[PDB]
Symmetry: D3
Subunit: 299 residues, 6 copies
C-alpha cells in the first residue's frame, strides 16, 4: 500500500526518454513541442566541470537538459561517457543530454553518441559542407555512415527500443538525435542564410564571445551599455535566418530574467545556469556579503 | 615596467601562508587574530564534491578557508591530497584548509596532514580521551607521536620554513595545525564542559543534525518555527562552554545574513556556502524561475 | 501514442525501489517476501571486478541484487560509491545492492551505506558484540548512532522518500537496510546459535573457504567426493540455527543447478554467477573448445 | 630443487614474444604459421570493457590474442596503454595484442603502437590510399614515417631486442607489427579486390553489422533464416579476394562451434568470446535458469 | 615579525609569471631576454611520466620550464590540464610550461593552451603551411581564430591580467604564447630556410632520432665516434637558419657538460634532465654500484 | 633460430619468482640466501610516487625489490594493487615487493598481500603483541587467520603454485611472505630485545627520523658531524639484537658508498635509491650545474 509503484506522485515525468536510459531521449520531439508551445521552451544547465559527481548533482535538480561542453570542458573519454549516462539515469530520463564537441574530433563525437547524447552542437560552423560531415558521422545509413557499436547494448538482454523491430536502436538514434550548428565567426554570420536553410539541422546557436573576438569588437566594452551595432546586425541576421526556416535557437541566459525576451526572439533551448561560473559567483558573493557584515565588529 | 613583480596590486594577500604551499598555513594564528578582532572572523566554503577541479574553482574565489569533508565526502586518498594542495596553491596561500576526518581512520588523518591541512575536525567527540588520541597522531614529539613523512619535501631543495633551523618543518606543523572537536550527540553535550576545557584544542564545532537525531528531536520539525527547547539548551551549554574557555566556535551559516548573530555567539570560522547544496539550489532555483517565466507563452 | 509512458510493457518492474535511486531499495521486505514464497528467492550476481562499467553491464541483466565485495574487491572509495549508484540506476531500481565490507573499516561501511547499499555482509563474525558494533554504525538513532551525511541529498530539491514526513530519509534507511553476519571460522560455528538468535539480523552467510582453512580441512580435497564430516556438521549447525530463528541464508551457487537444493536448505538470496570466475571460465572454455576443434586441420 | 626455474612444466609457452614484453610480439610470424598449419589458427578474445583489471583476467586465460576495440571501447589514453601492457605481461607474452583504432585518430594509433600492440585493425576501409596513410604512421622509415618515442625504453638499461644491433627496437616494430583493413561498407566491398591485393597488408576483416546497415539490409532480419543474398555475395567477394592474395581473414565466432567452418573459409585469427556480450549473456542466462528452477516452490 | 610577507628571502622569484597562475607566463619575453644575455638561457626538464605527482616534484626543483610531451607521453586530457597547472602553481610561477603536441590533435592543443602552456612545440614540421595551421588555432583574432574558453576564468572574480583592460586575458595569451616548429625529417631539413624565416615563430627544435631514422642513418652507430656527415650537414643547415633569422634553438643536453657548447651553437632553451631516462639511469646505476660493492663479501 | 625461446641470453633471471607473478616471490628464501652469502644482499629501490607508470620504470631497472610505502605514499587501493602487480610483472619476477603499511589499516594490508607483496614492514612497533596482530592477518591458518580472497585467481585456469597440491596457493603465501617490524621510537628501542627474539619475524628495520624526533634529538643537527650518542647507543642496541637472533636488517643507504659498511653491520636488504628524493636531487643538481656553466656568457 506504500511501495514506489503504489505512489504515483513519486514517479518520474520523463516525456521524451527512450526505452533504455543508455540511449538518447527524444530531443527532436522536445524541440518540436517547444516550437508548438513556447511555454515548453527547454530550460537546462551548462556543464563544464569534469566530474560525474557534479553531473549527478545537476541531474537531481531535473533540468530539461544538461549541456556538456567537450570542446572546452576537460572531460576524458570514459568520464564523458559516464557523465552522459549519469545525466540521463540520475534524472530518470527527464534530462536530455546535448554535447558541444570539438569541431574535428571523431572520437569525442562517437563517444557522445554511443553514450546517449540526444543533441550535438558543432562549433565554428561556416559552411554547409562542415555540417554535412557531421551528418555523415552522426546518423546511420541511409542518412549517414555512422559506425554501429556492439558494446552499447546486449542482444536479447538489453536492447529495448520505443520503435518496432528495432533491436539495434537504429531508429531510436536516427529519429531522436539532433544537430545544432554554432555560428561564431564573421564568415559564419556571412553565410548564415545557407546554414539555417539546411534540411538536416534541428537548431542554431550563436557564440557571442568568439564572434566578437573575430569581428574585432571590444568584448565587454559597452561604454554606456548598448552592444556594438555590428554585433546587433549579426544577431539580427542570425535570428531572422533561424526564424524564417523554422529552426529553434539554442542559447544561454546571462540572467534568468532574460528568458522571456529570449523566447520572444525564438530561443527554445536555454541554458539558465552554468556550473563553473554559477558556483564561482555563488561562493564569491557569499564570502563578500559575509565579510562585509562582519566589519561592524572591528576594533 | 609591467611585469607581475612591478604590479603590487596584483599580488596575493596571504597573511598566514607557510614558506611553501605544500605545508599548512597558520590557522592557529588566524583564529587568535579573529578572536582579537571579530571583523576578521574566517569566512569559508564547505567542500563535499570529490573533484579537484571544483577545489580549484572554490580556491579561485579566495575564501579564508576550504573545509573538506572526508567523513562523508567521497574523496579517494590521492584525490584528497590533491584537493588540499589545490586549495592552497590556487588561492596562492590565502585559503587555509580544514578537514573533517572519519573518527577512526588514521590514513585519512595522515593524508590530510601530510598534504598541508591546517585544521582537523573530529566528529562525534564524547570524551577527552578521544581527543587526546588525535593529539598523539597530529603532532610530532614532544607533543605527540605523529610519524614524519619523507615524501612531502626534498632536503636542501624544497624544505623552506618560516621557522629558524626547521629543515623538516616540524615547527611549522606543531605551531600551525589546529584540532577542532565536533560535538554532535547527547553524551557529547553532557560532557562538553570537560571537552571545552582541554588545553589542546583550538576550536569547537556543533553537529545539529546528528545531535537532533541522537536526541530524538524531529529534525526540521519546527511546527510554528522555534527550535526544540532541548536543542536550545544544548546549544547554550555548548556555546557557553566554548566562550568561558576562550575557544572559538566553528560552524556553518544556513543563510549568509546569519553571520552577525553567529559572530555575536562566538563563531570565528564560518562556512558561508556549501558546494553540493549551493550548486543544487542555484540550478534548481534558476530552472524554476525560468519555467515560471515561460508560462505566459502557453497556448 | 508511442512515447515511453504510453508503452507499459517497457516499464521497469522494481517492486522494492525507494523514491530515489540514490537510496537503498527495500531488501528487508524482499527477504521477508522470499521467506513467505521461496519461488521469490533473490537471484543475484557477485561483483569483484573494480569497474563501474562492469557494474553497468551486470545491472543491465536485471539481477535481483548485485553483491559487491569490498573486503577483497579492489574498489576505491569513490569507485565503490559509483558502482553502488550504477547498480541501482542502470537496473532502474530492480537490482538491490549488498556489500560485503572489510570487518573493521568504518569508511568502507559509511561509503556503502551513503551510496545506497541495502545490505551489509560482515565477514568473520564470531560474537554478538561484533555484530552490535555494526548495528551502531549502520542505523540512525534510536537504533544506532550512524552519522547523517549532508551530501547524499538536497533539501527541498532531491529528498523524496516512500515514508511520510521523512525529508532526511532516516525512515528509509532504518526500515530498508539489512545486516548479514558471515560465519567462516571454527569459533564462529561454535557460537552460531547465539549469533543466529540476534533480533538485529536479517540474514546469515557461510564462508566455506575460510572455514575449511581455519578448520584445517583440505579445501578442494574430496578424494572420492563427499565433503569432510567436520564441514558437514558445521553446515548443519549453521543452517539449523538460521532456520530455527527464521533467518534466511545468503550464499552462492557453484553451479546453477544447485539452486533448488539451496532453496530447500533455507537459502533466500543466492549469487548465481560471479563476475571474475564467470568471465574467466567462459573465455578459457571457449578458447579450449576452439583450439580443440582446429586440431583436425593439422598437417 | 623446487624453484620456478627448476619446474619447466610451469614455464610460459610464448612462441612469439619479443625480448621485452613492452614491445609487440611477432604477430606477423604467428599469422604466417597459422596459414601454413590452420590447426594453429589464433583463438582470441574481444575486449571492449575499459578496465585493465578485466584485461588481466582475460590475459590469465592465455588467449592467443586480446583484441582491444578503441574505435568503440571507452578506453582513455593511459588506460589503453596500461591494458596493452597488462595483456602481454599477465599472459607472460602468450597473448598478442590487436587494436582496432578510430579511423582518423593519430593519438590512439601511436598510443597502441608505443604500448606494444602487434596488430592494428583499420575500420571502414574503402581505398588503398586510406591504408597507405596507416602504413606511413605505423612503420619507421624506410617503410613509413612513424615517430620514434623516447619514453618506451631506457638506453643501455631496458632496450633488449630479438634482432641484432637493434637498440631502438626499430627492427622489432617493423618486422612484428601487422595492418588489417576492415571492410564494412558497400564501397569497401566494391573495391575489395584492390585492397586485398595490397602488398602492405597482413590480414582482412569484415564488419557484417556496419555493412548490412550501409547496404540497407535488415540486420537480424532472416525471416526463415538464410542471410540476404546481397550479403552472401559480399562475403563471397571478400573471402575470395583474401584467399587469392594469400591474406588471412580476421573475424569473430558468434558461437564456438562455427570455428571449423570459419577456418575452412580462410579465417586464421578468430575472436571466440567477447567480454561485454559474453559476461552479459552468462549472467542473464544464469539468472533465468535460477528463477525458472525456483518456480516449483511457489505457493 | 616572522610571517611569510615579512620574510622576503622566502619569496618566489618568478620574473615572467602572469597575474594568475592558471594563465601562461611570458615565455616570449623569457626567450628574448635569453637571446640578449645567454647566461639566462632557460634550463628545464623534460616530463614524459604521466603523473601530476611527478610534475609537482619536478616543479619544486624550480626549473626555468617543464617540457611536457603529449606527442608520446601518455597524458589523458584532464591529467594534462592538471600537470600544466601543477607545474606553474607548485613552482609559484617560476617554471614556464612548454608542450609538444601530437601534430594533428586539436584537443591536445586547446587543452594545453587553456591550461596555461606558454609554448607549443610542433613535431615533424616540413612546410610553412603546417605552422600556419597552428598559428590559426593558437592565437585569438586578429592573429588567429583560437576559440575562447569560458571555463578557464570567472568574470569579475578570477580574471586578473598583467595587461590593461584585458578581462578575458586575450592580450596575455597573444603576447605570452610561443610557437616552436620541430625539424626532424629529411624534407624538414630541406625546407628549413623557409621555416626558420617565418615571422610567426619564436623558436626552433631539431629531432635527431626521427631525423636519423628518416635519413637512413644508423642511429647510435658511430663506429669510432664522429656523427655521420649527413647529420652534421643537417644540423649545420638547421642551426645556421635559426641563427640568421634571430630564432633561438630549443633542445636537450645528453649530458649537462654539453650546455656551454649548446649555448655557443644558439640554444636558448635546454632540457637538462628527462624524467623517464633520468630516473631509470639513476636507479639502475645505484643498483649496479651497490651490487658491485657487495661482491667483496662473497663466500 | 632467433625466437625468444631460442635466445637464452635474453631470458629473465628470477630465482625467487612464484609460478604466477600475481603471487609473492620467495622473499623468505632470498633473505636466507643473503644471510648465507652477504654478496647477495638485496639491493632495491624505495617507491613513494603514486604512479604505476613509475613502478614500471623502476621495475625495468631490475632491482632486487621495490619497497612501496603505503604509510606515507599516496597510493589509492586499486593503484597500490596495480603497482604491486607492475613491479613483479615488468621485472618478470626479478623484483620482489615489500610494502610498508599504515600500522592499523587492515585494508592496506590485505590489498598488499592479495596483490602479491612478499614482505610487510610494520611501522612504529613497540610490543610483541602488535607484531602478533599482523601475524594473524598476514598468514592463513594454522599460522594465522588471514582471509582467503576468491578474486586473486581462477580455479583450474590460473592457479599454478610451486608447491604440491596447492591449488589455492596457501603454501605459497605462508612460505614466501615475510614480516619486518620497524623500530622507530624510544619505547621501541627499549623493548627491541624482545621484538628481535620473536620467532615469527624475518627482518628488522630502524626509522632514524621518527626515532630522533621521539628522542628529542636534533634531526640533522650534527654540529661537527658525529651523530648524537643517544642515537648511536640506540642503533647499537638495535643492530646487536638483530644480529644475536639471526635477523637480517632492512634499511636505506643515504649514499651508495655506504653499502659495504651497512652489510658489515648486518643489513641484508638495502634501498639504494628513493624515487622522490632521487628524482628531485637529480633534476635540481642538473639545473644548478647548467645555470652555473652558463654564467660565462653574461654580458
Ligand atoms: Mg565559441
Ligand atoms: Mg555529523
Ligand atoms: Mg571469507
Ligand atoms: Mg564496424
Ligand atoms: Mg621526434
Ligand atoms: Mg617512520
Amino acid at each position: 500500500a506504500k511501495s514506489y509503484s503504489e505512489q504515483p506522485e513519486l514517479h518520474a515525468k520523463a516525456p521524451y526518454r527512450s526505452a533504455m536510459l543508455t540511449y538518447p531521449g527524444n530531443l527532436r520531439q522536445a524541440l518540436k513541442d517547444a516550437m508548438a508551445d513556447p511555454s515548453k521552451t527547454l530550460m537546462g544547465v551548462a556543464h563544464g566541470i569534469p566530474s560525474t559527481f557534479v553531473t549527478k548533482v545537476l541531474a537531481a535538480t531535473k533540468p530539461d537538459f544538461v549541456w556538456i561542453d567537450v570542446e572546452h570542458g576537460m572531460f576524458n573519454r570514459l568520464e564523458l561517457h559516464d557523465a552522459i549516462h549519469a545525466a540521463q539515469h540520475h534524472s530518470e530520463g527527464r534530462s536530455l543530454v546535448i554535447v558541444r564537441v570539438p569541431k574535428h574530433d571523431e572520437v569525442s563525437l562517437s563517444t557522445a553518441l554511443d553514450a546517449g547524447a540526444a543533441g550535438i552542437v558543432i562549433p565554428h560552423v561556416e559552411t554547409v559542407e562542415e555540417v554535412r560531415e557531421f551528418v555523415k558521422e552522426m546518423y546511420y545509413g541511409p542518412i549517414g555512415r555512422r559506425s554501429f557499436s556492439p558494446w552499447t547494448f546486449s542482444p536479447g538482454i538489453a536492447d529495448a527500443s520505443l520503435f518496432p523491430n528495432d533491436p539495434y536502436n537504429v531508429a531510436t538514434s536516427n529519429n531522436h538525435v539532433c544537430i545544432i550548428p554554432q555560428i561564431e565567426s564573421v564568415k559564419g554570420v556571412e553565410n548564415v542564410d545557407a546554414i539555417a536553410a539546411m534540411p538536416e539541422i534541428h537548431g542554431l546557436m550563436f557564440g557571442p564571445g568568439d564572434y566578437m573576438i573575430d569581428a574585432g569588437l571590444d568584448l565587454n566594452g559597452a561604454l554606456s551599455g548598448v552592444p556594438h551595432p555590428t554585433f546587433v546586425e549579426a544577431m539580427t541576421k542570425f535570428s531572422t535566418a533561424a526564424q524564417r526556416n523554422g529552426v529553434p535557437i539554442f542559447g544561454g541566459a546571462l540572467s534568468v530574467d532574460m528568458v522571456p525576451s529570449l523566447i520572444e526572439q525564438g530561443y527554445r533551448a536555454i541554458a539558465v545556469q552554468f556550473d563553473v561560473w554559477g558556483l564561482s559567483r555563488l561562493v564569491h558573493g557569499s564570502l563578500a556579503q559575509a565579510r562585509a557584515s562582519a566589519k561592524q565588529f572591528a576594533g
